[PDB]
Symmetry: C2
Subunit: 302 residues, 2 copies
């Protein structure tokens, strides 16, 4: 009955050690302390007065190092330099973080899972995992004061920082910056209504989920009928799906269950219409929030 | 806010990551929890796979010395200087106090309560997730060979409350484990035999919490003036696979905020149980009982 799939996050300790509070005038949000740098969203510079069409150039010029105050709650640090990269501030502080993990910066693509460490006032408060949606939003849990919370993946013991929280959209979803300063989805870090694109289903994750179903023996939807890749991709452009792209991870799944991608691409075309009275893993709808990697690791332990 | 703002949220695991160690005895190897000068681990680490059903724990313990247990940290070796059994756990004494022990308590959790799990293998933490202790005293986890001794916990202020140490998987794929007083949740036995769990039920108080989250999101089509009292609901619950509803201060805060009374939602549950008749609540077509009142207060209302 129970598949052994849960929404699984990375242990957050390495990232907890890097969170600080950043304060500038009257805004206070979270920042990420790596080596001698503190990253935080540039809208810390902006009075609540004027959070639409903020003039970030003039705000920055307006600033000095004494403007910014960095506290470490979970020491206090002196800012001695400040620059702006896209929608992020790069603050230079006098002490290096002694607990900086090995890390890289990366940009996540639609379909990919990452962990988030939600923080308020520099204090870590919860962790959860999201999938970057095809419209470059995430379905998170963020309240006033959460900006600067960060999202990351792990390769080995290396942390790959991929997200810093910036805002909530009209429909309740969220977006943020990559650490190159760019906002996922081209969204503006200005407090104005903005058009979210239509969401789509993450095909490879649906495929990974059906493989999960088969590994748990629930395989009724498996018919010998097969559908090609480039055709399925034809069908998906009109039916709110994304391109399918195999990966070694998907391939491992095909091989332990001896059910080929293409049987499942066929199954999805049938299942998009309805489960037709049946359940798959206790759901009546397709599930696109589990990756091939999630399923390999949780069910088979790679 | 077509997105609810509700996700499966765990506590930050850093505090607990620094207490995980690997414990080995003969060739069975699993995880333990290092707090000050004590290391807690499941007692079936003492057991050889051959003898893993019908094992003689009182005797295995006798056959051990302090050198029989090797304890190692990765996230050094530790010297065990005493050993003892406490229900289904071992309490080992080591000669170094964990320099990163958090403030902690040992509190057994009740059905409906949520806790965070730090899944670990060979003493290395690999993932974290949250679960609800089900009414049949199982949890719906993700655990594989090697995960035993993985721990579940809550946080209250500075204080971690350790509430679970993982022991086993059941026939239906769910899991159970010990509280740190040594008892097993659900009376299950640390023997490798097929054991059948009792029937599961809906956690009434959590379904209420979740219907308050719906109202807070503007989804209130299911709210009517009609009401069912807690007594009447609890009578109906016994017959319809629901737990007894017990109110708390956390539920009450949701009722104050929304203006919708607990008893209106108990009535709604009686109606919604038989089907949503084509509607959805927060994108679901069935009742959701995995979110607690505390969950909803914190995630939607920023309340602790």
């Amino acid at each position: 009955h129970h598949s052994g799939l849960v929404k699984m996050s990375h242990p957050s300790g390495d990232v907890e050690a890097c969170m600080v509070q950043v304060t500038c005038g009257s805004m206070t949000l979270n920042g990420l302390w790596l080596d001698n740098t503190v990253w935080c969203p540039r809208h810390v510079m902006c009075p609540a007065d004027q959070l639409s069409d903020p003039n970030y150039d003039a705000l920055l010029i307006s600033m000095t190092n004494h403007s910014f105050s960095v506290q470490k709650h979970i020491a206090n640090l002196r800012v001695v330099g400040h620059a702006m990269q896209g929608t992020l501030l790069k603050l230079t502080v006098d002490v290096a973080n002694p607990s900086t993990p090995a890390y890289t910066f990366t940009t996540v693509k639609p379909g990919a899972a990452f962990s988030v460490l939600a923080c308020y006032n520099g204090r870590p408060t919860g962790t959860f995992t999201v999938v970057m949606r095809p419209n470059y939003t995430i379905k998170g849990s963020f309240l006033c004061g959460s900006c600067g919370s960060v999202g990351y993946t792990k390769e080995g013991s290396v942390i790959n920082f991929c997200y810093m929280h910036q805002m909530e959209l009209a429909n309740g979803t969220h977006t943020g910056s990559a650490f190159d300063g760019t906002m996922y989805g081209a969204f503006m870090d200005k407090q104005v209504h903005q058009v979210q694109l239509t969401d789509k289903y993450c095909s490879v994750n649906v495929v990974a989920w059906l493989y999960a179903a088969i590994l748990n023996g629930c395989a009724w939807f498996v018919k010998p009928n097969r559908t090609s890749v480039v055709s399925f991709n034809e069908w998906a452009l009109a039916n709110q799906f994304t391109e399918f792209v195999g990966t070694q991870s998907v391939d491992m799944l095909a091989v332990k269950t001896g059910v080929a991608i293409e049987q499942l691409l066929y199954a999805i075309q049938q299942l998009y219409t309805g489960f037709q009275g049946k359940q798959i893993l206790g759901s009546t709808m397709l599930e696109d929030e589990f990756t091939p990697e999630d399923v390999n690791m949780q069910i088979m332990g790679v």
